[PDB]
């Protein structure tokens with residue numbers, strides 16, 4: 462059985478020619494609205510939230526960890542390095558790497574976060590530790606974005622990622638200081654203007670992390686503070702049948718617009 466919300470999302474999906482996954486959590490009453498909420502989708506860059514959060518968790522017992530400089534070698538650079546390329550044969554702190562990964566989608570920065578955690582398995586272990594039984598990170602940048610049909614690697618479900626994002630940014634999966642830091646980073650994201658943000662009222666405060674990959678994979682996960690009511694969490698994942706499909710950030714904006722009706 463479907464609601465009018467789900468019917469609108471299905472119609473959007475059909476018009477788009479792809480596969481759409483949505484999960485909304487309204488923290489006013491803890492209700493969820495889902496569309497393909499339990500199907501796996503390639504996370505691409507939305508996985509960077511879990512990596513940054515894992516490092517924040519480490520820093521709860523290692524107080525200066527975020528300020529630890531990490532060397533950036535020429536050989537570290539991968540396919541998209543807008544911030545890390547400015548520090549070749551130099552350093553970035555784990556805070557700087559987190560900010561670059563989250564706010565500029567820097568892939569070299571993500572690889573340093575992954576390395577700090579002992580590899581992709583270290584990111585997954587953190588996910589399990591905070592109760593996310595679904596998330597899996599298998600690869601480093603750039604190959605974690607291959608978004609191949611049927612490939613379970615580097616996937617999660619909209620429901621799991623929404624629950625996790627809620628716990629990380631509004632709940633207490635992190636310490637109070639670390640939760641606030643993650644919120645600060647997400648709020649300052651530079652890559653999200655055309656995605657979930659474009660489908661929500663401009664007066665609402667939004668923190669988000671985008672992701673993109675092959676098969677026209679176009680993703681965004683967001684924590685949302687509407688005008689005068691409890692915050693929301695929204696995950697929008699989208700992927701398409703053919704490898705070189707174009708990005709469709711407009712589909713994410715449209716999904717957000719649909720979800721926001723009556724909120």
Ligand SMILES: CO/N=C(\C(=O)N[C@@H]1C(=O)N2C(C(=O)O)=C(COC(C)=O)CS[C@H]12)c1csc(N)n1
Nearest residue numbers: 505506541566603604606607652671672673674675
């Ligand atoms: C093998 O890796 N392939 C990638 C890829 O690096 N995706 C990553 C991801 O998620 N990113 C985001 C992202 O956050 O969406 C942006 C966006 O950065 C900015 C400036 O908005 C830059 S690319 C990076 C890719 C991306 S699209 C396509 N066919 N492939």
